[PDB]
Amino acid sequence: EYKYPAIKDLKKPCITLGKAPDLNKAYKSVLSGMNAAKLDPDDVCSYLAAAMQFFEGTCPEDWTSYGILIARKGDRITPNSLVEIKRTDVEGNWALTGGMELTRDPTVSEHASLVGLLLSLYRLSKISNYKTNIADRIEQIFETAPFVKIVEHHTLMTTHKMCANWSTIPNFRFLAGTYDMFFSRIEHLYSAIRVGTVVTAYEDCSGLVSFTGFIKQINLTAREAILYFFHKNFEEEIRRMFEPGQETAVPHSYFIHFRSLGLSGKSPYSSNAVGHVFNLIHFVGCYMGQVRSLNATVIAACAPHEMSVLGGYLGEEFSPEAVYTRIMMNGGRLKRSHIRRYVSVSSNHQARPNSFAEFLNKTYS
Amino acid sequence: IFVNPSAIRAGLMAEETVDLINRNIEDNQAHL
């Protein structure tokens, strides 16, 4: 709930890293670590930031967000244009550890592959198995022209196993978000790098994303859909999500990557922050049989018992006055028909701990 | 507790937030 992301002072998102390395040496050190599963997170970030210079493209339209100009139509930019990287006097370590067959200097094509593989440790870390499906596909993308094979199959997963928590290293998360924001705006030769960074888009905005996804699914306008959220706790939640000045409607705004770029540590759009709304949406998904909703986590604090009642009636539709009428007429209680339906779905589902399906089984079965 | 939705008719860029967010998520699918 606490911190809205809108930059108030025209300052670009900023991080500080060590002293800029010679890029050929940095490549060699970092590839060596990738091969030995022994990566240094400060070195990786320093390298990732310095490699930004290789990803130049033309801005197709003016680009401004929170008063900050990033580029004008036609400017040549790199991801470095989106942020400020400060650097200290302190050299990184740059150890050679694993295999280094390469005497000569790396090509730009080789840098981009390594950048791509390093960033993909963000996505792999973000998943709490199916990692090997993801990892094998990623490895293949980065062996496929315009990328170059620089590592052996199964290297990425081995290294990931050692880097499983890198998605909460703030500098690495920052660099993933910056590369994702760049390639979202600039169609680029190396755009397939987003395979690793795409998950930064809308991080900590589950409540807002559920809400917008719900509007699409019931196939109504946003004005019409808000009328169905008629319980009194929804009012402050809906206000919270449409706070002005936040650029939720602005294409390519820093808003889209606010969490990863550190604009706020305390999202007002998360599932917790709009818990009543989130709970209702997913009880409606449960009533419809949607597996995404049955395996979501209930927001314990936000009257899930009451949200489940409203969700039955809303689930029964799918007029907002007609729904309100039925609920008052029934004294705010579910009908036996609603209960039969919720139980039919939940009781046939592989219910996870703290999930909506578990709640339904504990409550109504 | 439950407020009447004919009473809710009197209240104030949500439409295009909805439309932007859903479209960006639809494109992000290509990368996943």
CSV table of C-alpha atoms in Angstrom, one decimal:
chain,number,residue,atom,x,y,z
A,1,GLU,CA,0.0,0.0,0.0
A,2,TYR,CA,2.6,2.5,1.0
A,3,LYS,CA,4.9,3.8,-1.8
A,4,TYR,CA,3.6,5.0,-5.2
A,5,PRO,CA,6.4,4.8,-7.9
A,6,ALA,CA,6.0,8.2,-9.7
A,7,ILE,CA,9.5,9.9,-9.8
A,8,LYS,CA,9.0,13.4,-8.4
A,9,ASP,CA,12.4,15.1,-9.1
A,10,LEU,CA,13.4,14.2,-12.8
A,11,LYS,CA,16.1,11.8,-11.6
A,12,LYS,CA,16.7,8.6,-13.7
A,13,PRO,CA,16.6,5.3,-11.8
A,14,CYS,CA,20.2,4.9,-10.4
A,15,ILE,CA,22.5,2.2,-9.1
A,16,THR,CA,26.2,2.1,-8.2
A,17,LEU,CA,28.7,-0.6,-9.4
A,18,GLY,CA,32.5,-1.0,-9.4
A,19,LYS,CA,35.0,0.5,-11.8
A,20,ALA,CA,34.2,-0.1,-15.6
A,21,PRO,CA,36.1,-3.2,-16.8
A,22,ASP,CA,38.0,-3.8,-20.0
A,23,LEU,CA,35.0,-5.7,-21.8
A,24,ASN,CA,37.2,-8.5,-23.4
A,25,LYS,CA,38.5,-9.3,-20.0
A,26,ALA,CA,35.2,-9.1,-18.3
A,27,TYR,CA,33.7,-11.4,-20.9
A,28,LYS,CA,36.4,-14.0,-20.3
A,29,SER,CA,36.2,-13.9,-16.5
A,30,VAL,CA,32.4,-14.1,-16.6
A,31,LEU,CA,32.2,-16.9,-19.2
A,32,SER,CA,34.8,-18.8,-17.1
A,33,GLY,CA,32.4,-18.5,-14.1
A,34,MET,CA,29.4,-19.5,-16.1
A,35,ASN,CA,31.3,-22.7,-17.0
A,36,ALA,CA,32.5,-23.4,-13.5
A,37,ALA,CA,29.1,-22.5,-11.8
A,38,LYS,CA,31.0,-20.0,-9.8
A,39,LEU,CA,29.8,-16.6,-10.6
A,40,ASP,CA,30.4,-13.3,-8.7
A,41,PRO,CA,27.2,-11.2,-8.6
A,42,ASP,CA,29.0,-7.9,-8.4
A,43,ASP,CA,31.2,-8.8,-11.4
A,44,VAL,CA,28.1,-10.0,-13.4
A,45,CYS,CA,26.4,-6.7,-12.8
A,46,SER,CA,29.4,-4.6,-13.7
A,47,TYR,CA,29.8,-6.6,-16.9
A,48,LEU,CA,26.0,-6.4,-17.7
A,49,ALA,CA,26.1,-2.6,-17.4
A,50,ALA,CA,29.2,-2.2,-19.5
A,51,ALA,CA,27.8,-4.4,-22.2
A,52,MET,CA,24.9,-2.0,-22.7
A,53,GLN,CA,27.0,-0.1,-25.3
A,54,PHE,CA,26.7,-3.0,-27.7
A,55,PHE,CA,22.9,-2.8,-27.9
A,56,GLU,CA,22.3,0.4,-29.9
A,57,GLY,CA,19.1,1.1,-31.7
A,58,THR,CA,16.9,3.9,-33.0
A,59,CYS,CA,14.0,5.3,-30.9
A,60,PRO,CA,10.9,5.1,-33.1
A,61,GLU,CA,8.9,7.8,-31.2
A,62,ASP,CA,9.6,10.3,-28.4
A,63,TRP,CA,10.1,8.7,-25.0
A,64,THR,CA,9.3,10.5,-21.8
A,65,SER,CA,8.1,9.1,-18.4
A,66,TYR,CA,7.7,10.9,-15.1
A,67,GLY,CA,9.0,14.1,-16.7
A,68,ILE,CA,12.3,12.4,-17.7
A,69,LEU,CA,13.2,12.5,-21.3
A,70,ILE,CA,14.8,9.2,-22.4
A,71,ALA,CA,15.0,9.7,-26.2
A,72,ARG,CA,13.4,11.7,-28.9
A,73,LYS,CA,12.2,10.1,-32.2
A,74,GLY,CA,15.2,9.1,-34.2
A,75,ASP,CA,17.8,9.2,-31.3
A,76,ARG,CA,20.3,6.3,-31.3
A,77,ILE,CA,20.1,4.8,-27.8
A,78,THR,CA,21.2,1.9,-25.7
A,79,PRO,CA,19.7,0.6,-22.4
A,80,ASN,CA,22.1,2.9,-20.7
A,81,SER,CA,19.9,5.9,-21.8
A,82,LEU,CA,17.1,4.7,-19.5
A,83,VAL,CA,19.0,4.8,-16.2
A,84,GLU,CA,22.1,6.2,-14.4
A,85,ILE,CA,24.8,3.8,-13.7
A,86,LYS,CA,27.3,5.3,-11.2
A,87,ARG,CA,30.6,3.6,-10.8
A,88,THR,CA,33.2,3.6,-8.0
A,89,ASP,CA,37.1,3.6,-8.2
A,90,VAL,CA,37.1,-0.1,-7.0
A,91,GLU,CA,38.1,-2.7,-9.7
A,92,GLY,CA,36.1,-5.9,-9.8
A,93,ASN,CA,37.7,-9.3,-9.1
A,94,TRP,CA,37.5,-10.8,-12.6
A,95,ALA,CA,38.9,-14.3,-11.7
A,96,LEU,CA,39.4,-16.9,-14.3
A,97,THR,CA,38.0,-20.1,-12.8
A,98,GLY,CA,36.2,-22.5,-15.3
A,99,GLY,CA,37.1,-23.3,-18.9
A,100,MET,CA,38.5,-20.6,-21.1
A,101,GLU,CA,39.3,-22.0,-24.6
A,102,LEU,CA,39.2,-18.4,-26.1
A,103,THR,CA,42.5,-16.7,-26.5
A,104,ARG,CA,41.2,-14.1,-28.9
A,105,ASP,CA,38.8,-11.3,-28.1
A,106,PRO,CA,35.0,-12.0,-28.1
A,107,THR,CA,32.7,-10.6,-30.9
A,108,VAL,CA,29.7,-8.5,-30.2
A,109,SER,CA,27.6,-11.6,-31.2
A,110,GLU,CA,29.4,-13.5,-28.4
A,111,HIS,CA,28.8,-10.7,-25.8
A,112,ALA,CA,25.1,-10.7,-26.6
A,113,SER,CA,24.9,-14.4,-26.1
A,114,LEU,CA,26.6,-14.2,-22.7
A,115,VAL,CA,24.5,-11.2,-21.7
A,116,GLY,CA,21.4,-13.2,-22.8
A,117,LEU,CA,22.4,-16.2,-20.8
A,118,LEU,CA,23.3,-14.2,-17.7
A,119,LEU,CA,20.0,-12.4,-17.6
A,120,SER,CA,18.2,-15.7,-18.0
A,121,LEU,CA,19.3,-16.5,-14.5
A,122,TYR,CA,16.8,-13.9,-13.4
A,123,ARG,CA,13.8,-15.8,-14.8
A,124,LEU,CA,15.2,-19.2,-13.6
A,125,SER,CA,15.6,-17.7,-10.1
A,126,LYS,CA,12.1,-16.2,-10.1
A,127,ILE,CA,10.5,-19.7,-10.4
A,128,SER,CA,10.5,-21.1,-6.9
A,129,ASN,CA,12.0,-29.7,-12.9
A,130,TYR,CA,10.1,-27.4,-15.3
A,131,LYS,CA,13.3,-25.2,-15.0
A,132,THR,CA,15.1,-27.7,-17.4
A,133,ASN,CA,12.3,-27.2,-20.0
A,134,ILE,CA,12.9,-23.4,-19.7
A,135,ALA,CA,16.7,-23.7,-19.5
A,136,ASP,CA,16.9,-25.9,-22.6
A,137,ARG,CA,14.8,-23.6,-24.7
A,138,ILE,CA,16.9,-20.6,-23.5
A,139,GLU,CA,20.2,-22.4,-24.3
A,140,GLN,CA,18.9,-23.0,-27.8
A,141,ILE,CA,17.8,-19.4,-28.4
A,142,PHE,CA,21.3,-18.3,-27.5
A,143,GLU,CA,23.0,-20.7,-30.0
A,144,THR,CA,20.9,-19.6,-32.8
A,145,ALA,CA,22.1,-16.7,-35.1
A,146,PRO,CA,22.2,-13.8,-34.4
A,147,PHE,CA,23.6,-15.4,-31.1
A,148,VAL,CA,26.6,-17.7,-31.0
A,149,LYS,CA,27.2,-20.9,-29.1
A,150,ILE,CA,29.7,-20.1,-26.3
A,151,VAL,CA,28.6,-22.8,-23.7
A,152,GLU,CA,27.8,-26.5,-23.6
A,153,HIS,CA,24.3,-27.8,-23.2
A,154,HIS,CA,23.3,-28.1,-19.5
A,155,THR,CA,25.7,-25.4,-18.3
A,156,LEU,CA,22.9,-22.9,-17.7
A,157,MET,CA,21.0,-25.2,-15.3
A,158,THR,CA,24.1,-26.1,-13.4
A,159,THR,CA,25.0,-22.5,-12.9
A,160,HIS,CA,21.4,-21.6,-12.0
A,161,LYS,CA,21.4,-24.3,-9.2
A,162,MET,CA,24.3,-22.1,-7.7
A,163,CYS,CA,22.5,-18.8,-8.4
A,164,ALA,CA,18.9,-19.8,-7.3
A,165,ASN,CA,18.3,-16.5,-5.4
A,166,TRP,CA,19.7,-14.0,-7.8
A,167,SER,CA,16.2,-12.6,-8.6
A,168,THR,CA,16.3,-10.6,-5.3
A,169,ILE,CA,19.9,-9.2,-5.7
A,170,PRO,CA,18.8,-5.6,-6.3
A,171,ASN,CA,21.4,-4.6,-8.8
A,172,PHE,CA,20.9,-7.7,-10.9
A,173,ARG,CA,17.1,-7.2,-10.8
A,174,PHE,CA,17.7,-3.6,-11.8
A,175,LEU,CA,19.7,-4.6,-14.8
A,176,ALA,CA,17.1,-7.2,-15.9
A,177,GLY,CA,14.4,-4.5,-15.7
A,178,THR,CA,16.4,-2.0,-17.6
A,179,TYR,CA,17.2,-4.5,-20.5
A,180,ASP,CA,13.5,-5.6,-20.5
A,181,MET,CA,12.3,-1.9,-20.8
A,182,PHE,CA,14.8,-1.2,-23.6
A,183,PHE,CA,13.8,-4.2,-25.7
A,184,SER,CA,10.1,-3.6,-25.0
A,185,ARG,CA,10.5,-0.2,-26.8
A,186,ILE,CA,13.2,-1.0,-29.3
A,187,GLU,CA,12.6,-3.9,-31.7
A,188,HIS,CA,16.3,-5.1,-31.8
A,189,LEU,CA,18.4,-7.8,-33.4
A,190,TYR,CA,19.0,-9.3,-29.8
A,191,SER,CA,15.4,-8.7,-28.5
A,192,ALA,CA,15.1,-12.4,-27.7
A,193,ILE,CA,17.0,-11.6,-24.5
A,194,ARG,CA,13.6,-10.8,-23.1
A,195,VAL,CA,13.1,-14.6,-22.7
A,196,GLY,CA,15.0,-14.0,-19.4
A,197,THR,CA,13.8,-10.5,-18.4
A,198,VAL,CA,10.1,-10.5,-19.5
A,199,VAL,CA,9.1,-11.5,-15.9
A,200,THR,CA,10.2,-8.1,-14.6
A,201,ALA,CA,7.2,-6.6,-16.4
A,202,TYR,CA,4.5,-5.7,-13.8
A,203,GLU,CA,6.3,-7.4,-10.9
A,204,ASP,CA,4.4,-6.7,-7.6
A,205,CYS,CA,1.3,-5.7,-9.5
A,206,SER,CA,-0.8,-8.9,-9.2
A,207,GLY,CA,-3.8,-7.1,-7.8
A,208,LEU,CA,-3.9,-4.6,-10.7
A,209,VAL,CA,-3.2,-7.3,-13.3
A,210,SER,CA,-5.9,-9.6,-11.9
A,211,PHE,CA,-8.3,-6.7,-12.0
A,212,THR,CA,-7.6,-5.7,-15.6
A,213,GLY,CA,-7.6,-9.4,-16.7
A,214,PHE,CA,-10.9,-9.8,-15.0
A,215,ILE,CA,-12.5,-6.9,-16.9
A,216,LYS,CA,-11.4,-8.4,-20.2
A,217,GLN,CA,-12.7,-11.8,-19.3
A,218,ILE,CA,-16.2,-10.7,-18.3
A,219,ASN,CA,-16.1,-8.6,-21.5
A,220,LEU,CA,-17.3,-5.3,-20.0
A,221,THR,CA,-16.1,-1.8,-19.9
A,222,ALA,CA,-14.1,-0.7,-16.9
A,223,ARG,CA,-17.0,1.7,-15.8
A,224,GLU,CA,-19.6,-1.1,-16.0
A,225,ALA,CA,-17.4,-3.7,-14.3
A,226,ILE,CA,-16.7,-1.4,-11.3
A,227,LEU,CA,-20.4,-1.4,-10.5
A,228,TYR,CA,-20.2,-5.1,-9.6
A,229,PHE,CA,-17.6,-4.4,-6.9
A,230,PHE,CA,-20.3,-3.1,-4.5
A,231,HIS,CA,-19.0,-4.3,-1.1
A,232,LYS,CA,-17.7,-1.3,0.9
A,233,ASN,CA,-14.1,-2.4,1.3
A,234,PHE,CA,-13.6,-2.3,-2.5
A,235,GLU,CA,-13.8,1.5,-2.6
A,236,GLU,CA,-10.4,2.3,-1.1
A,237,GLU,CA,-8.8,-0.5,-3.1
A,238,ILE,CA,-10.1,0.7,-6.4
A,239,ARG,CA,-9.1,4.3,-5.5
A,240,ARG,CA,-5.7,3.0,-4.6
A,241,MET,CA,-5.2,1.5,-8.0
A,242,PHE,CA,-6.2,4.6,-10.0
A,243,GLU,CA,-4.2,7.1,-8.1
A,244,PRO,CA,-3.4,9.9,-10.6
A,245,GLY,CA,0.1,10.6,-12.0
A,246,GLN,CA,1.3,7.0,-12.0
A,247,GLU,CA,1.3,6.4,-15.7
A,248,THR,CA,-0.5,3.1,-15.7
A,249,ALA,CA,-1.9,4.0,-19.1
A,250,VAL,CA,1.3,5.4,-20.6
A,251,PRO,CA,3.0,3.1,-23.2
A,252,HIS,CA,6.6,2.2,-22.2
A,253,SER,CA,6.5,4.2,-18.9
A,254,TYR,CA,8.9,3.4,-16.1
A,255,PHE,CA,5.7,2.3,-14.3
A,256,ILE,CA,5.9,-1.0,-16.1
A,257,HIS,CA,9.2,-1.9,-14.5
A,258,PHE,CA,8.9,0.2,-11.3
A,259,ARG,CA,9.6,-2.6,-8.9
A,260,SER,CA,12.7,-4.0,-10.6
A,261,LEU,CA,14.2,-0.5,-11.1
A,262,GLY,CA,13.6,0.2,-7.4
A,263,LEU,CA,11.0,3.1,-7.8
A,264,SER,CA,9.1,1.5,-4.8
A,265,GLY,CA,9.7,-1.3,-2.4
A,266,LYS,CA,6.1,-1.3,-1.3
A,267,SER,CA,3.6,-1.8,-4.1
A,268,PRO,CA,0.1,-0.4,-3.8
A,269,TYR,CA,-1.0,-2.7,-6.7
A,270,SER,CA,0.1,-6.1,-5.3
A,271,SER,CA,-2.3,-8.9,-4.3
A,272,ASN,CA,-2.0,-8.0,-0.6
A,273,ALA,CA,-2.5,-4.3,-1.2
A,274,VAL,CA,-5.8,-4.8,-3.0
A,275,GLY,CA,-6.7,-8.0,-1.1
A,276,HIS,CA,-10.4,-7.8,-1.2
A,277,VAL,CA,-10.5,-7.2,-4.8
A,278,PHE,CA,-8.0,-10.0,-5.5
A,279,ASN,CA,-9.9,-12.4,-3.3
A,280,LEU,CA,-13.2,-11.7,-5.1
A,281,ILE,CA,-11.7,-12.0,-8.6
A,282,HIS,CA,-10.2,-15.4,-7.8
A,283,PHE,CA,-13.3,-16.8,-6.0
A,284,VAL,CA,-15.0,-15.9,-9.3
A,285,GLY,CA,-12.3,-17.8,-11.2
A,286,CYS,CA,-12.8,-20.8,-8.8
A,287,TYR,CA,-16.6,-20.8,-9.4
A,288,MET,CA,-15.8,-20.9,-13.2
A,289,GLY,CA,-13.3,-23.8,-12.8
A,290,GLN,CA,-10.1,-21.8,-13.6
A,291,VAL,CA,-7.0,-23.5,-12.4
A,292,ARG,CA,-5.0,-20.3,-12.2
A,293,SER,CA,-7.5,-19.0,-9.6
A,294,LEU,CA,-7.8,-22.3,-7.7
A,295,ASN,CA,-4.0,-22.4,-7.2
A,296,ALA,CA,-3.6,-18.7,-6.3
A,297,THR,CA,-3.0,-17.8,-2.6
A,298,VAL,CA,-5.8,-16.3,-0.6
A,299,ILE,CA,-5.3,-12.9,1.1
A,300,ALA,CA,-6.1,-14.1,4.7
A,301,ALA,CA,-6.7,-10.6,6.1
A,302,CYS,CA,-9.2,-9.4,3.4
A,303,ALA,CA,-12.5,-11.1,4.4
A,304,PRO,CA,-12.1,-14.1,2.2
A,305,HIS,CA,-15.4,-15.6,3.7
A,306,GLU,CA,-17.4,-12.6,2.5
A,307,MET,CA,-15.5,-12.3,-0.8
A,308,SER,CA,-16.5,-16.0,-1.4
A,309,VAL,CA,-20.1,-15.2,-1.0
A,310,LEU,CA,-20.0,-12.2,-3.4
A,311,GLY,CA,-18.0,-14.4,-5.8
A,312,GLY,CA,-20.7,-17.0,-5.9
A,313,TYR,CA,-23.3,-14.4,-7.0
A,314,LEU,CA,-21.0,-12.8,-9.4
A,315,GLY,CA,-20.0,-16.3,-10.6
A,316,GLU,CA,-23.7,-17.1,-11.0
A,317,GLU,CA,-24.0,-14.0,-13.4
A,318,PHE,CA,-21.3,-14.7,-16.0
A,319,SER,CA,-27.1,-6.2,-14.5
A,320,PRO,CA,-25.2,-5.2,-11.3
A,321,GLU,CA,-28.5,-4.2,-9.7
A,322,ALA,CA,-29.9,-7.7,-10.3
A,323,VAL,CA,-26.9,-9.2,-8.4
A,324,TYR,CA,-27.1,-6.8,-5.5
A,325,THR,CA,-30.9,-7.7,-5.3
A,326,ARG,CA,-30.3,-11.4,-5.0
A,327,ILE,CA,-27.6,-11.0,-2.3
A,328,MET,CA,-29.8,-8.7,0.0
A,329,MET,CA,-32.8,-11.0,-0.6
A,330,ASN,CA,-30.8,-14.0,0.6
A,331,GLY,CA,-29.5,-12.1,3.6
A,332,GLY,CA,-25.9,-12.0,2.3
A,333,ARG,CA,-25.7,-15.9,2.4
A,334,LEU,CA,-24.8,-18.3,-0.4
A,335,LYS,CA,-27.5,-20.5,-1.8
A,336,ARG,CA,-27.1,-24.3,-1.7
A,337,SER,CA,-26.7,-24.1,-5.5
A,338,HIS,CA,-23.6,-21.9,-5.1
A,339,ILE,CA,-22.1,-24.1,-2.5
A,340,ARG,CA,-22.7,-27.3,-4.5
A,341,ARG,CA,-20.8,-25.7,-7.4
A,342,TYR,CA,-17.9,-24.3,-5.4
A,343,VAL,CA,-17.4,-27.8,-3.8
A,344,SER,CA,-17.8,-29.6,-7.1
A,345,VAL,CA,-14.8,-27.7,-8.4
A,346,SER,CA,-12.6,-27.5,-5.3
A,347,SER,CA,-13.1,-31.1,-4.2
A,348,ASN,CA,-12.0,-32.3,-7.6
A,349,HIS,CA,-8.8,-30.2,-7.6
A,350,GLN,CA,-5.3,-30.8,-6.4
A,351,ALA,CA,-5.5,-28.2,-3.6
A,352,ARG,CA,-2.3,-26.4,-2.6
A,353,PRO,CA,-1.6,-25.0,0.8
A,354,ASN,CA,-3.1,-21.5,1.4
A,355,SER,CA,-4.8,-21.7,-2.0
A,356,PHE,CA,-8.3,-20.6,-2.9
A,357,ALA,CA,-9.1,-24.4,-3.5
A,358,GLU,CA,-8.0,-25.3,0.0
A,359,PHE,CA,-10.0,-22.4,1.5
A,360,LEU,CA,-13.1,-23.6,-0.3
A,361,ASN,CA,-12.6,-27.2,0.8
A,362,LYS,CA,-12.0,-26.2,4.4
A,363,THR,CA,-14.9,-23.7,4.4
A,364,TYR,CA,-17.8,-25.4,2.5
A,365,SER,CA,-17.0,-29.1,2.3
B,1,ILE,CA,-21.7,-3.6,4.1
B,2,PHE,CA,-23.1,-4.1,0.6
B,3,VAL,CA,-23.8,-0.7,-1.2
B,4,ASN,CA,-26.4,-0.4,-3.9
B,5,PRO,CA,-24.9,-0.2,-7.5
B,6,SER,CA,-27.6,2.3,-8.7
B,7,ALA,CA,-26.0,4.6,-6.0
B,8,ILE,CA,-22.6,3.8,-7.5
B,9,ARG,CA,-23.5,5.4,-10.8
B,10,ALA,CA,-22.3,8.8,-9.4
B,11,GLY,CA,-18.4,8.5,-9.4
B,12,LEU,CA,-15.5,9.8,-11.6
B,13,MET,CA,-8.2,7.0,-17.2
B,14,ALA,CA,-9.1,3.4,-16.1
B,15,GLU,CA,-10.3,2.3,-19.5
B,16,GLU,CA,-6.9,2.7,-21.2
B,17,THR,CA,-5.0,1.3,-18.2
B,18,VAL,CA,-7.1,-1.8,-18.6
B,19,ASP,CA,-6.5,-1.8,-22.4
B,20,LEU,CA,-2.7,-1.1,-22.1
B,21,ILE,CA,-1.9,-3.6,-19.4
B,22,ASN,CA,-3.9,-6.5,-21.1
B,23,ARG,CA,-2.2,-5.8,-24.4
B,24,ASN,CA,1.3,-5.7,-22.9
B,25,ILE,CA,0.6,-8.9,-21.1
B,26,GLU,CA,-0.6,-10.5,-24.4
B,27,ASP,CA,2.7,-9.5,-26.1
B,28,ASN,CA,4.8,-10.6,-23.2
B,29,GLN,CA,3.4,-14.1,-23.9
B,30,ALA,CA,5.7,-14.4,-26.9
B,31,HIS,CA,8.7,-14.3,-24.6
B,32,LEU,CA,7.5,-16.8,-22.0
